[PDB]
Structure formats: structure tokens, C-alpha cells
Copies of this chain bind each other. A is one copy, B any other.
């Protein structure tokens, strides 16, 4: 029934299947220029100690394109993202979305308004092209810096973005204008952290921020930073220390519907 979630547990101070996934850019695949590296990695994982039949692969055309409703495909996910001086925000937001869980609702921006009433209520935008425009409203439902009867004088927050997390002043109403033909926006609540996917950044210094709070932008015990020159060295290093990554992660947060975010109407 309720699994005894309200019944206190008690221990003592006297008592003394699995799957693996890898996510890589197609640039590495072109650099390797081989059609059997999958076999090599599979056999190396088999020899290291992880039984064969539990290692798969997946590729994306670009970092932003992979963010179009990202999915999960294993009970263990190790994702590698290339570093750049321009795609910092996309990497950070994608890591924030795929590092935790979410509970979203469908939203309509032509028949009602919306508001956020906590520090964990955010709006998630995903699609091939999102153009979000938001106009704040006061108590008497008037226009402040933008006209309700018009739709060309709002405040810009997105421009041809494939993934953007928007936050407004929590506790006030808004009117949203967006081309819903190709992109949708969902009101979500961050229930808690997810312990099934670990993000490893290759390139420069650690820059991934998972908290919109300025005062606290911490680094978790799962985001890794390794320098790289050739992708084969990175693959060998990851295979070499697989047990540590397995231990720091967990297998008790598998999603049954294989979706990075839950979508309840």
C-alpha cells in the first residue's frame, strides 16, 4: 500500500541486473574513423569485470540538439560534453535538467496566465526553436512596460533556443507569448536530485552551475573535470576507473518511462 513510508525504521550499531551507457559527440566518432570501436570498448569492459550485454552507445549531432527532450537509455548513464567559451549556458542548463528529477504540467499561453509560488517552481522550455516573451502584470491586471493588447513590446528572454530555463519573480502573474508551433513550455517543480546520471566535462575549468541561486552555485560529488587531447585517451581513462564512478553513483533511481522529466497533466 503505502510501503510503510510513515512507519519509523530502526537498525543497530552491532551488525557487521546492471547496464551501462555512454553519450558522446559525433566529432569523436569522426576522429576515431573506425566502425569497430564499439566492439573494442565492449570487450574491454568485459575484461575489466563488467559482463558483456550491458554496454550500449548513443550519439548526437550537437550539444543543443541533444537537449531536445533529452532521454535516458540505461540504469547507469555517463555523459561527456565538450567545453567551449560560448555554449556555457546550454551545458549548465542541460546538466541541471538531466541531473535531477522534475514534475511538470502542460501550459497554455492563450487562455490563462501563470505564476510561481516557491523557489523550486520553474518553467522549462524545450523544442527546436523557442521564442519566449513574458510581460509582468500587477494586482489590477494592467500593463507594466508592455501592452497586453499588443504582442510586439514584451521582454526578450529567448531567441531560437533549444533549451532555456526561465524564472520570474516568484509569486506574481505573467502573460507569456511564444510560437507554440515548434516549442512548448512546462511548469515544473524540482522534487529532488537524481542519482542515475553523472556529467563529466572535458575541456577547461568547472563551470556547470545547477542552481539559479546566486549565493549558492556549488559543485556536486558527481560532476567530473578531465583534460583531453584525444578521445581514445579519455575512453581508456573512463574504463580504467569505472568502479569509482559506479560507487559514487547509484542504481536506485531508474526511471520506468525513460524520460528525463516527468510530465503529469
Q: Hey, which bits of chain A sit against chain B, CB under 8 A?
A: 1-10, 17, 19, 21, 32, 34, 36-40, 42-44, 47-48, 52-53, 56-57, 71, 73-75, 88-89, 92, 101-108, 111-114, 116-117, 119, 136, 138-139, 144-145, 155-159, 161, 166-172, 200, 203, 205-207, 209, 212-217, 221, 224-230, 232-233, 236-241, 244-245, 247-248, 252-259, 261-265
Contact = CB atoms under 8 A, between A and B. Distances in A.
B138 A170 contact: no
A130 B32 CA distance: 19
Copy number in the complex reads 4
Given A170-B240, A255-B263, A256-B264, A8 B3 contact: no
Contacts of A258: 1-3, 5, 104
Nearest to A71: B257
Nearest to A38: B111
Nearest to A202: B214
23 contacts: A1-B6, A3-B258, A4-B8, A7-B7, A21-B265, A38-B111, A48-B171, A56-B111, A73-B105, A88-B203, A102-B256, A119-B241, A158-B229, A159-B230, A167-B237, A205-B205, A209-B226, A214-B224, A214-B226, A217-B224, A253-B264, A255-B265, A257-B265
A63 to B, nearest CB: 15
A37 to B, nearest CB: 6
A258 B213 CA distance: 27
Contacts of A221: 215
Contacts of A32: 155
Q: Is the interface of A mostly helix, strand, loop or mixed?
A: loop
A105 B241 contact: no
Contact of A4 (B43, B225, B252): B252
Contacts of A145: 34, 36-37, 39-40
Contacts of A217: 224-226
Contacts of A256: 2-3, 101-103, 254, 263-265
